[PDB]
Design a protein around this ligand. Structure first.
Ligand SMILES: Nc1ncnc2c1ncn2[C@@H]1O[C@H](COP(=O)(O)OP(=O)(O)OP(=O)(O)O)[C@@H](O)[C@H]1O
Ligand SMILES: Nc1ncnc2c1ncn2[C@@H]1O[C@H](COP(=O)(O)OP(=O)(O)O)[C@@H](O)[C@H]1O
Lengths: 753, 131
């Protein structure tokens, strides 16, 4: 049977297009761009134009949700594609809307919606076929209950569409696309792939998997911040695969009455077990599964015991999987993390700017945008928001846009006109207003993400960059050489040098080159962790980093431990030693198998405790020289390429007057020059209106020197007053530490072997 | 390191179950790494948390006095600086035999290098004892 093809999503928006490989097209005796007839469940026939795309595999057939509902199948299923390129032209069209799709609209679908929908689309419509058109804010379905010729016809210019009459009732086969699916979720590609991998097999082939006789996973958790669509994810997966999704809520159950919650939960279990291979979803289990010490009452312990006993009675034969969602896996009782119980754990992180872009796109899909679309800019601006945040943002932006025209339109209270809602478009001004009155949610929460610092941002130190490349990229690039020599790569690297050299910038650059996530640690954060919750935070951050390999575990202000412990304070030494011991234990427990690098940075190497100065710990210590002259201008260019400068006298001379200046004071000088330029432009403008306040329009135009171009005057003002960041004696201590490590070397000379 | 981790907080029970576990696995050998680290807290840049060090030392001495002769479990302790540590340990019925560690010398270095080279590569291009 080399004709049936496994279904796959059709990226094309066109409902009646399917992408086929050329050998399948030739084998099935099909033309180019012709129509194929597909049968699925109940031998329901659907006619679809062959789409010119061989991207999908030959065994796969691209086929979107609309045809899938037409064929009464699900994702991962098959098709019955049979040769039928002799489709006939349309004669008359008798399609009416479903009752529950145009409520509260009171408009004409034919001209407003159907006319552009069928304009040069030539969609093959068959008697009984379902086709959807997405409009100003909603999506409307239609069915070809009866047509000429029978059963299929081609959308053709000689068309007679009867869109007049009462909307059609329910056809009782559902096939409604208003529900959720895989394509309705964005920003979780990896997580979705994992869930598909570990879920599809038992559901796709239950009897076959029983014939395998191998225990499948049964306890899976998703943990993350609220409002991220975990319920959405579970519902979409269950609906797409085909199951009997069941939901249970904590508060709705625990506060029913006395101990009746036990009866309710039981009844749920045997109800689910008695229907089909299904999924049981639990929300906010921590509300009913607190910590053991947190169990101040008694009935809570009874409920937890009942739940554990009931779920553990899932002996081998069980086609039901249990999905449970909650926050961070901390408050949950540890015994639930046992085998047979919840063992698989998945995190749903906050999507990046790109993820925000897809979330906006899938949310703003229905709304008619204006021509001022800056979705990328908005996604840039909306750090600290989740999918629910973006959905609400889009909603209230739409309300702001609509509300701008209430007086002009006859508001009334009876009905609305589809033209009115079609006319309104969301403008970037509306988005700015919406963001003005907004509330980000994430805020106080650590973010994990691949950094975006590139190599040309920092000038010089190319040899050191290559050394870091060797230490970092090469072991994962060429583990074969390491195993051939049987030598273990270095665990981590430490940096020491004058501040303002952008060591963190180098860490971000190397992480971005490695294409691994970045983790930031702050000295103030560490000192906050000194008192109170100390071990738990270190343990959880280490575990999170180990989970998300490959990743870069960066540390900043590592010397801060000695800053408060050593010196004239001598008080927070206990907490500092607690933190240090915890760090040492966690890093010693780390395995070289995990692709995690520990990076510590400091500007006070002498004060550093020598405990870490041991093998297995941070041993590769790198000095950061202070760049002066040479490639300084390049660094200047790196910080000057951000904005235009055009006319300049000389950068080499600028490097000549300065000497022993880090990136910090150089960037400060650049910012000062930009500030003076802004001041000059603003004062010239203010002079222009202070001339025009008593005068008519005096041609307020670009003649204000607003182009980015720093004159020599600003540079001279900057160099008039600019203090050296580093003191020479500090350089003396840095060289003293270099000589100290030279003495620890002792031998650097050359003797012939 | 984990000794100092315990040093903040549990200092009496923890040693108790540790030595109970050691007793259960008889015969066995117990090893202590950098005992002077405890005195490093006693003598160091702070010198103020010494109550926990007192607790640890008292527990250790009490257990050593509680070690019956029938049990066959040796105890070894490595210390870089014997001077800072409390001499009260150095008494009969406790740690008594002190062994100095000489630096590797030529043939010792040659054997060490040979053992290191046992991993995979060969060094048939130089004279090890020369180095
Ligand atoms: N990645 C996403 N893609 C699409 N919609 C999303 C996404 N994340 C959140 N949403 C939207 O945000 C809302 C989240 O709804 P819901 O309360 O079910 O989510 P949740 O994160 O599972 O919440 P809960 O904490 O109650 O489990 C929905 O309107 C959903 O459409
Ligand atoms: N293009 C560049 N090249 C080198 N260093 C830079 C550049 N841009 C910024 N920097 C430096 O990066 C520093 C910020 O990183 P930071 O972690 O503060 O380093 P440090 O701790 O050494 O001050 C700034 O002080 C600045 O001197």
């Amino acid at each position: 049977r080399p004709n049936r093809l496994i279904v796959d999503e059709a990226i094309n928006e066109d409902n009646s297009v399917v992408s086929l490989s050329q050998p399948k097209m030739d084998e099935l005796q099909l033309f180019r761009g012709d129509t194929v007839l597909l049968k699925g469940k109940k031998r329901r026939e659907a006619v679809c134009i062959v789409l010119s795309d061989d991207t999908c595999s030959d065994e796969k057939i691209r086929m979107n949700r609309v045809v899938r509902n037409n064929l009464r199948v699900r994702l991962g299923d098959v098709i019955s594609i049979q040769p039928c390129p002799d489709v006939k032209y349309g004669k008359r069209i008798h399609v009416l809307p479903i009752d529950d799709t145009v409520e509260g609209i009171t408009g004409n679908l034919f001209e407003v919606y159907l006319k552009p929908y069928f304009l040069e689309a030539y969609r093959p419509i068959r008697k009984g076929d379902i086709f959807l058109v997405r409009g100003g804010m909603r999506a409307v379905e239609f069915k070809v209950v009866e047509t000429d010729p029978s059963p299929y016809c081609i959308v053709a210019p000689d068309t007679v569409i009867h869109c007049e009459g009462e909307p059609i009732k329910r056809e009782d086969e559902e096939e409604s696309l208003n529900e959720v699916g895989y394509d309705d979720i964005g920003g979780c590609r990896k997580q979705l792939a994992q869930i598909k991998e570990m879920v599809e097999l038992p559901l796709r082939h239950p009897a076959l998997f029983k014939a395998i006789g191998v225990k499948p996973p049964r306890g899976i958790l998703l943990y993350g911040p609220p409002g991220t669509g975990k319920t959405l994810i579970a519902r979409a997966v269950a609906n797409e695969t085909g199951a009997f999704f069941f939901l249970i809520n904590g508060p709705e159950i625990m506060s029913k009455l006395a101990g009746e919650s036990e009866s309710n939960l039981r009844k749920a279990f045997e109800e689910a077990e008695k229907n089909a291979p299904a999924i049981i979803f639990i929300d906010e289990l921590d509300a009913i599964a607190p910590k053991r010490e947190k169990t101040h009452g008694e009935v809570e312990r009874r409920i937890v015991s009942q739940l554990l006993t009931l779920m553990d009675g899932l002996k081998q034969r069980a086609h039901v999987i249990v999905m449970a969602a909650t926050n961070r896996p901390n408050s949950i009782d540890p015994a639930l993390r046992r085998f047979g119980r919840f063992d698989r754990e998945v995190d749903i992180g906050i999507p990046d700017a790109t993820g925000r872009l897809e979330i906006l796109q899938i949310h703003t899909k229905n709304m008619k945008l204006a021509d001022d679309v800056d979705l990328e800019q908005v996604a840039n601006e909306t750090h600290g928001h989740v999918g629910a945040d973006l959905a609400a943002l889009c909603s209230e932006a739409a309300l702001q846009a609509i509300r701008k025209k209430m007086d002009l339109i006859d508001l009334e209270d009876e009905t609305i006109d589809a033209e009115v809602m079609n006319s309104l478009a969301v403008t970037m001004d509306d988005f700015r207003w919406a963001l003005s009155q907004s509330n980000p949610s994430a805020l106080r929460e650590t973010v994990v993400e691949v950094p975006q610092v590139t190599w040309e941002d920092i000038g010089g130190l190319e040899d050191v960059k290559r050394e870091l490349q060797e230490l970092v990229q090469y072991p994962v690039e060429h583990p074969d050489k390491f195993l051939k020599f049987g030598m273990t790569p270095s665990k981590g690297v430490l940096f020491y040098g004058p501040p303002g050299c952008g060591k963190t910038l180098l860490a971000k650059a190397i992480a971005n080159e490695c294409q691994a996530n970045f983790i930031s640690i702050k000295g103030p954060e560490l000192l906050t962790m000194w008192f109170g919750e100390s071990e738990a935070n270190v343990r959880e951050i280490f575990d999170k980093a180990r989970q998300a390999a490959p990743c870069v575990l960066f540390f900043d202000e590592l010397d801060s431990i000695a800053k408060a412990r050593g010196g004239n304070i001598g008080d927070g030494g206990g907490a500092a030693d607690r933190v240090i011991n915890q760090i040492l234990t966690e890093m010693d427990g780390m395995s070289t198998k995990k692709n995690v690098f520990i990076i510590g940075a400091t500007n006070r190497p002498d004060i550093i405790d020598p405990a870490i100065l041991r093998p297995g710990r941070l041993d590769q210590l790198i000095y950061i020289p202070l760049p002066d002259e040479k490639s300084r201008v390049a660094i200047l260019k790196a910080n000057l390429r951000k904005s235009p400068v055009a006319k300049d006298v000389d950068l080499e001379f600028l490097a000549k007057m300065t000497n022993g200046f880090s990136g910090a004071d150089l960037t400060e000088i650049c910012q000062r020059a930009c500030k003076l330029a802004i001041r000059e432009s603003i004062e010239s403008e203010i002079r222009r209106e202070r001339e025009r306040q008593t005068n008519p329009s005096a041609m307020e135009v670009e003649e204000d020197d607003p182009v980015p171009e720093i004159r020599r005057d600003h540079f001279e003002e900057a160099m008039r007053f600019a203090r050296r960041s580093v003191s020479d004696n500090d350089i003396r201590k840095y060289e003293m530490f270099a000589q100290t490590l030279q003495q620890s070397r002792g031998f650097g000379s050359f003797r012939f072997p």
